[PDB]
Design a protein around this nucleic acid. Structure first.
Length: 25
DNA sequence: GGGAAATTCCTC
DNA sequence: GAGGAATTTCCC
């Protein structure tokens, strides 16, 4: 309700869920 | 102060 | 309606 369009970016306290790293097995 | 990952807004 | 592109934040 305060600002209309939200800016582009990663919210505060957003942790990474899926790791884009390579798996071992 | 740089890099990486995630979310959002805009065009066709 | 759906997809592509751009910007922000956290950690070392």
């Amino acid at each position: 309700v305060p600002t209309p369009k939200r800016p582009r970016g990663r919210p505060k306290g957003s942790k990474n869920k899926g790791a884009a790293k390579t798996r071992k097995t």
